[PDB]
Design a protein around this ligand. Structure first.
Ligand SMILES: Fc1ccc(C(OCCN2CCN(CCCc3ccccc3)CC2)c2ccc(F)cc2)cc1
Ligand SMILES: *[C@@H]1O[C@H](CO)[C@@H](O)[C@H](O)[C@H]1NC(C)=O
Ligand SMILES: *[C@@H]1O[C@H](CO)[C@@H](O)[C@H](O)[C@H]1NC(C)=O
Length: 531
């Protein structure tokens, strides 16, 4: 009842709809990003959500223990864990920035209002060049002007290192909801009501709701939309399976999938609406076009929202409340992502059941030491590289392998009966077709297009060198290469001839009685042709 609805709210809003979605909408065409996003959502965001929810609820294992249905494909369980670790590495930095801004908001005069300060260049325009908020961010919080690229980083900054330490301590002691869940909705509604009334908001709304029919012919908005759907829904991170492994057996995993995706899409739409409504007003007030008012990067919202707060009556209170909300949202997301990895590695190995605090300490210390790279002078370059290369092709490859392993090796007709065991009904033809044919081919197309059509990352005008791209590709392939290695190890470890090795490697562990009598279900084509 109310506990069910309060659980949907927690999954409906996260840091991926407030921080990344508007920045990806602005980077691509305004309104040309909403067509691939909605198409990919409808096609392969509900089937995958349903699949992971049901798999976790039925097999009662975190991330790699659910692969008793196909022992040879356990490498995706480690791939998703590596992806989660990589994501958390740069996920901590956003919380550090939010803490910095929250501490800086306790003033009678906000520091990002005018440019008379010591961190301002002559190229600053006051309501007329660079805006005071972007200059304040870059040259007072990041100190980006002292870095000459990714090959020249410098020592870490002592102001942001303290925030990172505080975030790490809080996360560890939280890992070892009535107020925390309904605060972002109130804040976003208030911001939307404010931004609707601003003089130049209609132009931004029109640019947001207009679809450009020439930006859809480029193979970048599709990849961005697919990766953003994966980021927002949590598919491909190992989080949904781990969360659902604790749910009741006779739980309706279909209604949850139907409702959570709808509410998530509505929240994403509202966030983009607010951001573009403020962008239009800024562009009108600065006498510049909408596309030439900011840079495409993870500095949006951090540049926009302070300027929106500055126009409210008592701006200090609004700023404090907004940054507290952002801090809580980021903490929740990071703690969930880290708990996924911790529980997966605890379930996998047996010695660690006597190493709980001494394992969480190791994980958080490694995360802190790896996040220390992004608090240097040139940390935004490392942030951009990580954001481009940690997920994307690797996460889509992992999702494709998971879908293939569940729908072709185990069997969609057996998955349906497993669902019908816990819930009184079984999936219809639409769900089975989407699981078996529609989703895998689209995922394969997106993966192939992403690999063949490579676009180097950039931050405004800086173009990354060759070795940066090589290191990024190594980082991306490190998690992807976990499937063939485990497959080869599993094949070589099992005893018997080739046929017996294959039979024990592809058949489920609950079918050993049938396999021992020469009754392998995967040695006939009726099993592979059945939808
Ligand atoms: F095991 C679980 C325990 C708790 C939760 C809570 O949700 C967290 C919301 N997720 C949204 C999806 N994000 C995508 C990954 C990004 C990321 C970031 C850093 C490192 C790695 C990955 C992860 C976070 C929750 C909240 C209300 C509730 F009622 C129940 C659970 C989930 C699973
Ligand atoms: C900046 O400060 C100087 C000295 O305090 C002052 O003369 C100048 O007018 C200020 N700039 C603006 C735009 O007011
Ligand atoms: C700032 O403006 C001056 C002109 O007054 C210009 O010469 C300089 O290049 C500008 N700085 C930039 C664009 O970084």
């Amino acid at each position: 009842k109310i506990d069910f609805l309060l659980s949907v709210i927690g999954f409906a809003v996260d840091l991926a709809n407030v921080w990344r979605f508007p920045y990806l909408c602005y980077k691509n065409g305004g309104g040309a990003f909403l067509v691939p996003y909605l198409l990919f959502m409808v096609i392969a965001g509900m089937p995958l959500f349903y699949m992971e929810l049901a798999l976790g609820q039925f097999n009662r294992e975190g991330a790699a223990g659910v692969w008793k249905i196909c022992p040879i494909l356990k490498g995706v369980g480690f791939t998703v864990i590596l992806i989660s670790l990589y994501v958390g590495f740069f996920y901590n930095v956003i919380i550090a920035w939010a803490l910095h801004y929250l501490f800086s908001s306790f003033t009678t005069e906000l520091p990002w209002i005018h440019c008379n300060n010591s961190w301002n260049s002559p190229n600053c325009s006051d309501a007329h060049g660079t805006t005071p908020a972007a200059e304040y961010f870059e040259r007072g919080v990041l100190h980006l002007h002292q870095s000459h690229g990714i090959d020249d980083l410098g020592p870490p900054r002592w102001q942001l290192t303290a925030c990172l330490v505080l975030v790490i301590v809080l996360l560890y002691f939280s890992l070892w909801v009535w107020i925390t869940a309904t605060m972002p909705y109130v804040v976003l509604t208030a911001l939307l009501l404010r931004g609707v009334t601003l003089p130049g908001a209609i132009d931004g709304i029109r640019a947001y709701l207009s679809v450009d029919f020439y930006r859809l012919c480029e193979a970048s908005v599709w990849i961005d939309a697919a990766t953003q759907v994966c980021f927002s829904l949590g598919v491909g991170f190992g989080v949904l399976i781990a969360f659902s492994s604790y749910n009741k057996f006779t739980n309706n995993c279909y209604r949850d999938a139907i409702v959570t995706t709808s509410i998530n899409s509505l929240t994403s739409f509202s966030s983009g609406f607010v951001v573009f409504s403020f962008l239009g007003y800024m562009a009108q007030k600065h006498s510049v076009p909408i596309g030439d008012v900011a840079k495409d990067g993870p500095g949006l919202i951090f540049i926009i929202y302070p300027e929106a707060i500055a126009t409210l009556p008592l701006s200090s209170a609004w700023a404090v409340v907004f940054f507290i909300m952002l801090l809580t949202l980021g903490i929740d997301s990071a703690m969930g992502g880290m708990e996924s990895v911790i529980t997966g590695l605890i379930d996998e190995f047996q010695l660690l059941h006597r190493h709980r605090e001494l394992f969480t300490l190791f994980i958080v210390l490694a995360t802190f030491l790896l996040s220390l790279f992004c608090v240097t002078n040139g940390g935004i370059y490392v942030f951009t590289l990580l954001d481009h290369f940690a997920a994307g092709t690797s996460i889509l490859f992992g999702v494709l392998i998971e879908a293939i392993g569940v729908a072709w090796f185990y069997g969609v007709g057996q998955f349906s009966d497993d669902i019908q065991q816990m819930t009184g009904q079984r999936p219809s033809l639409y769900w089975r077709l989407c699981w078996k044919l529609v989703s895998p081919c689209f995922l394969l197309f997106v993966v192939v297009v992403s690999i063949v059509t490579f676009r180097p990352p950039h931050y405004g005008a800086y173009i990354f060198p060759d070795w940066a791209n090589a290191l990024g590709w190594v980082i991306a392939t490190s998690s992807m290469a976990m499937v063939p290695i485990y497959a080869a190890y599993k094949f070589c470890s099992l005893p018997g001839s080739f046929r017996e090795k294959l039979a024990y490697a592809i058949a489920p562990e609950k079918d050993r009685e049938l396999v021992d009598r020469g009754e392998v279900r995967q040695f006939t084509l009726r099993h592979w042709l059945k939808v």
